[PDB]
Symmetry: D2
Subunit: 233 residues, 4 copies
DNA sequence: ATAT
DNA sequence: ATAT
DNA sequence: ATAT
DNA sequence: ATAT
């Protein structure tokens, strides 16, 4: 199977697989069962911002998820990603729906990685996604160009989201996530998202993830698996 | 054939194909016969710096090449790259040798591209090249990892450059070089290089280039063709 | 008197002092009488974007001004700023009103300057202005904090722009704009602005400027003098 | 007195004031008596790199100090700088000598601060310091321009360092270090340094510091006080 | 930019 | 490096 | 770039 | 929202 590190914005509690009984953000290390979660007051139909940060000095993966008129949710986990990820990775966004549904609309995405050894750097910023975006690998249901946005999961022409959908967007270039020689390795990711449901239970969520370079949507990974994992282990 | 725009650091005069009688820098638009050249005092065995700049406002491709404690060489050509290049490109470095030879050593390479529509940006910086550099596509004789450098052309075990060699390195991700709705599109590239010849007459040169995404070394493009062009037309 | 280089967004034709008979952008080198102008369709009450660029290779000061869903206005002038400005400068925004008036609201301002000798760089970005913004020098009627915006000219309690007003904001740190040993010197500025007039004939305009470090609003430089020049010579 | 937060590279143990019995790096919060220290193998006459990082999510001030052929030293302290520093600060480098001496040579210094609320940013980079550097406030013995370096303390023409010297360099612009509205505030500082002594005990060290905007070298603050503190409390 |  |  |  |  793939190697996954992710930050999940989990809109739907799957009590049976160890989610808390509320919408939550979490840190996923090689399992959909988050090593750490925080309660998240997801605002149906509002544009939110996710900020993800890590550096090889603190070795602490942290995320903040926020809306304009509101308190942030934040979650952190101490993990040495040198011991988890391969040296070279792809970075991506992933989203899914199951019996329940939501738009998994990405309005912007930026990423920066640095190896300060003589610094190697990578930075990309998408504030507009276009119809034939050749620096993105789209997987499953993911599409670009609709209002300059990335729709990770299936949405109708009138803006109605579909169930049993899964989709991912990976940056085309492999990323040098860690290097043994590096004295400082850091990365940060920012995305803006619009999660909207007619349902009283939106599902299932959006994740920022880092994977082996050849990562693909695992078979059946709609619903609670967020397009990331082959099972709930 | 491929579409090529390039800045050549041409160490060897091929007067036969319209090079001036001296080492020169030039702007190449779909031909090895430069639309503009400037005289270049290439310093055998010294580390030089090439700076390349373009924006959609002035539509002027400019380059400056320098060594510490010496006058720069500079060349500029008015060209609308929207009318020359496809919307999506790859960017790369290329070098060749023929009957005469030189190290075509790259010590660092950086690149930035920006579309201000809401700005999309791409930036990479290599100050160290590693043995298995997965964000580079190496073509022909190009290798990485030797002293943390990119050797565009074949260098022997004893450090001797070889004749009739050609090699290129392209950044793995396609680049959105122009867009109809962009109000400002800009790019810049910087690389540092070490050209050393144990004989007199070094040959043949190093180029920064922009190509169609699927660009490959034209067969036989050693010597005066700089790994860029299938012929000297 | 001060040394001024500016890009004017001139909303009011002063044909008396050589303005064209229409709202225009221009390049001002030590005179309010622009060395080059382009026609500008200023959109009353809309948020616009000004982009300004210069490098020591082309020695061409260029500006583009745009609104969403409209054609840009662009203006360029060949000028060696090494021969005009002192080595160290301050950069700023300036605006004025006279018998006629307009809001001269700035929503965002960014600036980057680079001397590649070993690169020295300065970059600031304001997307929000605060009430006590200690990295800005406010001159004349300029205020910050009103809706997180910079109001270059006086606006009444009921939001009405006032006549005979002039105001400027300079970045607190002096900027190394050129250096003899630099092989490449470059700068760019971006600002977003909202010009609104409740009457017809808005006046008088907004400028990005570069000045001697100790620059101050010339006394009486309201109206057509744009807070930049002591007279119309 | 001033408010100080600093990272000290402390070359000289002052056992009487709570230094450990070896050259150390430490985190100083409003006292020369470090809240946390780590052992530091200072390499007399070699160029080192100091990296300092903080963000408002982890609220952990961390530093790494390294030389090319060697293991790094790293030190971290959990501290909410919102509760320690004023909202607006200056950032600087400081160094001192006493009975014992060392060159306190700074070869490069960079700084970035961001308030992600709509992001406000500041970035400067000095790879060359010039004789009349108007974006630096030099205090005490500090001088620029000698080989493009910043000498924080007195050095003779032949490169011999003097005792009882103290000097600081502050960036001219005030820095917005924290903001109540900000969802993420981050900063990072990098400097390259050359500490060289003929003595077997070099003294006294180099600090990166953040202070009230009007910070000045306290009276008598040579030797163990590093130009930062009025006393050893 | 529209009016005398 | 010198003082207890 | 220097030699025939 | 339905199953125990
Ligand atoms: O400051 C400039 C120095 C002057 C150099 C003058 C040229 N010297 C020279 C020539 N001229 C004919 C060019 O072709 C000769 C060989 O061609 C092969 O080698 C070159 C270099 O690798 C390459 O560009 C060609 O494509 C081909 O591979 C001589 O014959 C001679 O000597
Ligand atoms: O699309 C452009 C619209 C056409 C405007 C034509 C001018 N209208 C106009 C003039 N012309 C003379 C200019 O001076 C009049 C008043 O001058 C004062 O006000 C302006 C604006 O604040 C300022 O630039 C001057 O410096 C002075 O303060 C009229 O008299 C009239 O109406
Ligand atoms: O806390 C838990 C609930 N409550 C939600 C039930 C809906 C209430 C509002 C409608 O009346 C559950 N339910 C059991 C989990 O299984 C739900 C169905 O699973 C599918 O759908 C979800 C959402 O798309 C996916 O996560 C899942 O993979 C399945 O496809 C709790 O545990
Ligand atoms: O661990 C401690 C030492 N050892 C160093 C003594 C020199 C050994 C090599 C020479 O033979 C000390 N010494 C006592 C501390 O006082 C030293 C003198 O203080 C002045 O000089 C230092 C260095 O510039 C300053 O820090 C201080 O402020 C005074 O100006 C230990 O505690
Ligand atoms: Ca879930
Ligand atoms: Ca040639
Ligand atoms: Ca005017
Ligand atoms: Ca000490
Ligand atoms: Mn979960
Ligand atoms: Mn040529
Ligand atoms: Mn004008
Ligand atoms: Mn100490």
């Amino acid at each position: 199977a793939d190697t996954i590190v992710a930050v999940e914005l989990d809109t739907y509690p799957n009590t049976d697989i160890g989610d808390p009984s509320y919408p939550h953000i979490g840190i996923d290390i090689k399992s959909v069962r988050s090593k750490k979660t925080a309660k998240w007051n997801m605002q149906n139909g509002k544009v939110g911002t996710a900020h993800i940060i890590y550096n090889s000095v603190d070795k602490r993966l942290s995320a903040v998820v926020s809306y304009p008129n509101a308190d942030s949710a934040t979650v952190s986990y101490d993990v040495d990603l040198d011991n988890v990820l391969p040296e070279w990775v792809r970075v991506g966004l992933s989203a899914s729906t199951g019996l329940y549904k939501e738009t998994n609309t990405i309005l912007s995405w930026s990423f920066t990685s640095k190896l300060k050894s003589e610094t190697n750097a990578l930075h990309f910023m998408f504030n507009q996604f276009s119809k034939d975006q050749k620096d993105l690998i789209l997987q499953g249901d993911a599409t670009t160009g609709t209002d300059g946005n990335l729709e990770l999961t299936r949405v109708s022409s009138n803006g109605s989201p579909q169930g049993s959908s899964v989709g991912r967007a990976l940056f085309y270039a492999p990323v040098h996530i860690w290097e043994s020689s590096a004295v400082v390795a850091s990365f940060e990711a920012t995305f803006t998202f619009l999660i909207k449901s007619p349902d009283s239970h939106p599902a299932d969520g959006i994740a920022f993830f880092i994977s082996n370079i050849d990562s693909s949507i695992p078979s059946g990974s709609t619903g609670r698996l967020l397009g990331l994992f082959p099972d709930a282990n």
